[PDB]
Structure formats: structure tokens, C-alpha cells
Design a protein around this nucleic acid. Structure first.
Ligand SMILES: [Mg+2]
Length: 580
DNA sequence: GCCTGACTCGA
DNA sequence: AGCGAGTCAGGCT
């Protein structure tokens, strides 16, 4: 049963109504400088398909797209906005984004096309994109009749689904979360992606040359120590050398076979000289393949920039993710890897990189939501939280805290921030499960409010079916009742952790919105480039650094008011590396 | 060519 | 017996 629509070959007035569902279709996964294959508009007047070479060369249509007062409902409006930015056209007036709506209503559904969103309200008069475009090698744009019908069906679904999504959002007290937070952030993210980050490719390449030379030396050493050649990158072949030829002890197994993970190899190093060489090889080879060759592959030779895509609709927490490239895991802990960040430079001469990061935002949120007196006091005094945690769990004074005590308290703190289990903690600290449970018990005696929060939030998840964040983001936890221990225990941890990590996410998202408004109010040229969970990275003219030193931390600090202060550290320099 | 497992990087 | 992302090897259709 085909859906009625006009396959127009000129733009008409009735296509430019002030409320419409709009589809601006970009089929390439990476939408930067990507083709727009077709356009559909559904409004009070009717349903329309337009060919993009017609529509996007039409002054009236382009004006309509750019007119804030002409309201549009879309799915994944950031994809469309960015593709249009590459063509010199602004998209404004997007007042409803179905992707973001579906994501807020239930992030566990994994909604990534109109059809998956529509199915949530029993609407099935639209096909999945995968059924129309194909997948992998077979992926293709079909002939115009099939394409046009698909785009009009997606637009009609958007038109029909706006009301029931907005109604459920409102029942959930999430309507302002959509309208005041996620949608405005989606525009800000679109600008960041489009701007991109400049890369000194010449420095990356010379780095790669040194690494290649280093890898070759260590690789030869390994063959000599093994007395043969083999694929060092294959955990199977490496397993045969280590555990069969060299008869090293098997300390841990993986579902497939013998574990060759870094932590197992650390413990084998005293038996054989090969082990340290393998570890060195794995460190260098990760830098080379993931961070030098991987970045070079996605730099546009055209501008020497990388344009990441932020997935705002993926995580259970509310966190953002970053792809092509992933700019959220650039090395920093070890000096050799950290030098990679010397390759990320300002895009204009006499500009600098500015970076501002929250200090312990997750634990500060926990203090706030648990109202734990001791944790709150510690933050109100701006104490070193790991030293203070050590003093309390070991019952020592400050000057009796040894480096090992601090490291282990830091690990407990880490476990709380990321919701890891007693098994996780034990793995992390290389201790027994029993000792790890002892650590946790000690922590709860020092922080009874945290313990009480942890009990209460698990009960609330059981009673309501879900937990919520500070700004009303929601996670459903149906596994909370399960009779499988490991399935149930995971859900309980997610009940504990999601209000911590998801509230941190909420705050930094609001800070991004507040900051973009302030930058414009202050007439600064400073621009946001990246977000990395608890940190914001900007670039600006050197003449703006002193003002940004005062402005950026203040905006981030004041994004919300909690029972404890928020605290923001900042740095700036010639490269991302130097903004430390 | 497509999928999966093993490994490792960040916050 | 955390999460996402990317790389690599090795296995099947
Ligand atoms: Mg920090």
C-alpha cells in the first residue's frame, strides 16, 4: 500500500508552512561533507518529496530552513544540520528531535532509526533504514521511487509521533530535559564537529617514524628470545610461545584459551626476558596502530582537521561518546603516549588551546545526593579526597598515609565512581575477593550516608523500575529482580552508579550550554572544540586567555548548585599537550 | 566480506 | 563478574 505524496520538481509556498516534519537524508555513516540524497516535508498541506539539487538551490527553501520561526520536527537533526553546514546552509527552528526524545524515554532500546522509535508507540507504517539501504558491502541508495517513498514515510511517522512522545516526556518530567538541554546541546555539538580540531600531521608522522624504528628493534629481540618468528599480535600464537615453548605458568584463562593480558604478563616477567619485551611491544604498537595511523587516516588532507562525530543518543548514563576519531581516549597517563597530544594544535595562528576540567565531580555529586556528612565536609574543606579516604579507612593521621595506602583508597574511590564489583576491585588491586569486601565494609563505616544511599537507591530501583539523575534522566533496571546473582548484582550497581555518573553528565551538558551563551554575550571568539566527560577543550586568540581563565571555570562551577562546591581546574598552551 | 573475541586506551 | 571505541587475528559462509 503506497503512501500518497507529491514528487515535486519545484518548491511551492505550501511546502514552507511554519510547522513541518522534515527529513534531510544523509545515508553515509560519517556525515561530514556527505551527500544529501533527498528531502521530504510533511505538513498541514500535504506530503512532499524534493530533489536536493532543486530544493537547496531554491532561495525560498533555504530561507525557510534558516528561519527559526518556521518549526521543524526531525530525527537526528544534528546529522542534517552538519551536512548542511558543509554546504553553506543553516538549519534553524528544530523544535522536536525524535531520536533525542526516544533516547530520553528509554536509552536501553538502542533507537537508531525512525522505525525503532515508531515501534515504541505501535507505529509500523515505516521501514527500517537497513531494509531500504542494505548493509555493509551491499549498502546502496535505491532508485528514486523507493527512496522517495521511504523518506515521506519517515516524515509522516515523525509528524504522527511528536505528540505521544512529548506527552510521555511530560508525564516523566523530562520535557524541559529535551527542550532546554538535549536539543540546544545538539546544535552546540554540531558547531564543534563542524569546526573540527587542527592536527600537526607532520609531527604525527615523524612520531610514527620513530615508533616504527623502535618497534622493529623490540620485534627482532622478541624473535631472538623466542628462538623463532611468529605473529606477536596474535594472542593465540603468543600463547603457544609463552605457555608451550617456554613453559611459563598459566595464571589465568580466557573463554578461548590462555590469557596474555598486560596484568598477567607483569606477573610472568621474572621467569623470562621475553615478557618485558612483549609488554614494550604492545605499548608501542598500540600507539602506532591506534593513535598515529588511526588519526592520520581520518585527518582531512583538505584542512588538516579531524571532525569527530559525537553520539548523543547511545549511553545508558547520559554520557557522550566520540567516533572517527574517538577523541576521548587520547593517551595521557604515560609520557611516551602523552606526546601524541602535541599533535593537536589551534586552528589559527596566535590562538591557544584552553582546557578546563571538573575536579572529582562524580564524588561531589555522590556527596550531594547521599548527604554523607563526612564526604560533604571533606569537599567543603577542599581536601585531597584520596588521602582523606585513606586516613578514614585505615584510621591513620595524615602524615601516616603511605603511598600504597593512598593508591588503594584511590582504587576504592574509582570503584565507587564506575560502579565496579568487589570482584572488580579485587582484580584492580590484585588482592582477594574477601579482602576487597573488607575494604568496602571499611569505607561504609567511614561514610554511612553513602552506604545508606546505596541501600535506598537499590530499593527505589526495585519499587519504581528505574533510577533517575539530577535533571530527570532515567534508566530502567528490569534485571534488579532477577534470580541470577551476577545479572541482579550488575543491575544493583547500575542503580547505584547511574545517578552519580549521569548527574555528572547532566551538569557538564548544562555547563556547555551556559558557556556557549556566555561566550556570545561577552563577544569572545573563543570556540568549544571537544568534550571529554568531565573536561571542556576550547581554542581562542591568545588575547582572550586571561578572560577565559575567569569566565570558563565560573560558568562550569555555577552550572548547578549542590550541597558542596564544584571546582574547576584550567590550563592553556600551544598544543593540547601543553594545556596541562 | 562479516562477525567475534582478546586487548587497551580515557574519564 | 564497569563502559565505549578501535585494532587485530582468525573463523565461517
Ligand atoms: Mg578531572
Amino acid at each position: 500500500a503506497k503512501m500518497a505524496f507529491t514528487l515535486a520538481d519545484r518548491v511551492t509556498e505550501e511546502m514552507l508552512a511554519d510547522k513541518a516534519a522534515l527529513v534531510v537524508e544523509v545515508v553515509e555513516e560519517n556525515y561530514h561533507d556527505a551527500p544529501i540524497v533527498g528531502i521530504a516535508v510533511v505538513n498541514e498541506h500535504g506530503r512532499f518529496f524534493l530533489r536536493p539539487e532543486t530544493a537547496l538551490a531554491d532561495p525560498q527553501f533555504v530561507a525557510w530552513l534558516g528561519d527559526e520561526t518556521k518549526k521543524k520536527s526531525m530525527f537526528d537533526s544534528k546529522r542534517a544540520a552538519v551536512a548542511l553546514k558543509w554546504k553553506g546552509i543553516e538549519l534553524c527552528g528544530v523544535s522536536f528531535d525524535l531520536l533525542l526524545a526516544a533516547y530520553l524515554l528509554d536509552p536501553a532500546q538502542g533507537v537508531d532509526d525512525v522505525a525503532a522509535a515508531a515501534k515504541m508507540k505501535q507505529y509500523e507504517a515505516v521501514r527500517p533504514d537497513e531494509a531500504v539501504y542494505g548493509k555493509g558491502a551491499k549498502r546502496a541508495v535505491p532508485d528514486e521511487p523507493v527512496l522517495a517513498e521511504h523518506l515521506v514515510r519517515k516524515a509522516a511517522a515523525i509528524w504522527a509521533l511528536e505528540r505521544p512522545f512529548l506527552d510521555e516526556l511530560r508525564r516523566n518530567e523530562q520535557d524541559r530535559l529535551l527542550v532546554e538541554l538535549e536539543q540546544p546541546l545538539s546544535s552546540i555539538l554540531a558547531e564543534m564537529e563542524f569546526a573540527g580540531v587542527k592536527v600537526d600531521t607532520k609531527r604525527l608522522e615523524q612520531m610514527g617514524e620513530e615508533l616504527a624504528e623502535q618497534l622493529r628493534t623490540v620485534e627482532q629481540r622478541i624473535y631472538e628470545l623466542a628462538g623463532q618468528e611468529f605473529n606477536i599480535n596474535s594472542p593465540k600464537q603468543l600463547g603457544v610461545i609463552l605457555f608451550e615453548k617456554l613453559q611459563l605458568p598459566v595464571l589465568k584463562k580466557s573463554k578461548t584459551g590462555y590469557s596474555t593480558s598486560a596484568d598477567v604478563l607483569e606477573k610472568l616477567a621474572p621467569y623470562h626476558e621475553i615478557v618485558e619485551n612483549i609488554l614494550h611491544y604492545r605499548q608501542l604498537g598500540k600507539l602506532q596502530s591506534t593513535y598515529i595511523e588511526g588519526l592520520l587516516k581520518v585527518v582531512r588532507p583538505d584542512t588538516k582537521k579531524v571532525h569527530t562525530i559525537f553520539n548523543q543518543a547511545l549511553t545508558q548514563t547520559g554520557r557522550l561518546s566520540s567516533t572517527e576519531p574517538n577523541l576521548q581516549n587520547i593517551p595521557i597517563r604515560l609520557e611516551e603516549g602523552r606526546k601524541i597530544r602535541q599533535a593537536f594544535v589551534p586552528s589559527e595562528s596566535d590562538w591557544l588551546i584552553f582546557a578546563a576540567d571538573y575536579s572529582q565531580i562524580e564524588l561531589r555529586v555522590l556527596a550531594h545526593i547521599a548527604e554523607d556528612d563526612n564526604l560533604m565536609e571533606a569537599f567543603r574543606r577542599d581536601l585531597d579526597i584520596h588521602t582523606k579516604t585513606a586516613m578514614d579507612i585505615f584510621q591513620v593521621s595524615e602524615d601516616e598515609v603511605t603511598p600504597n595506602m593512598r593508591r588503594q583508597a584511590k582504587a576504592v574511590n574509582f570503584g565507587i565512581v564506575y560502579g565496579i564489583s568487589d570482584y572488580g576491585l579485587a582484580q584492580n588491586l590484585n588482592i582477594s575477593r574477601k579482602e576487597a569486601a573488607e575494604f568496602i565494609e571499611r569505607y561504609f563505616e567511614s561514610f554511612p550516608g553513602v552506604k545508606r544511599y546505596m541501600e535506598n537507591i537499590v530499593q527505589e530501583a526495585k519499587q519504581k523500575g528505574y533510577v533517575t539523575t539530577l535533571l530527570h534522566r532515567r534508566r530502567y533496571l528490569p534485571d534488579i529482580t532477577s534470580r541470577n546473582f551476577n545479572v541482579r548484582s550488575f543491575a544493583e550497581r547500575m542503580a547505584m552508579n547511574t545517578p552519580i555518573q549521569g548527574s555528572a553528565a547532566d551538569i557538564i551538558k548544562k555547563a556547555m550550554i551556559d558557556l556557549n551563551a556566555r561566550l556570545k554575550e561577552e563577544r569572545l571568539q573563543a570556540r568549544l572544540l571537544l568534550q571529554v566527560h568531565d573536561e571542556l577543550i576550547l581554542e581562542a586568540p591568545k588575547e582572550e586567555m586571561e578572560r577565559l581563565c575567569r569566565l570558563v571555570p565560573e560558568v562550569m562551577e555555577q552550572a548547578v548548585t549542590l550541597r558542596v562546591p564544584l571546582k574547576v581546574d584550567y590550563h592553556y598552551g600551544s598544543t593540547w599537550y601543553d594545556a596541562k
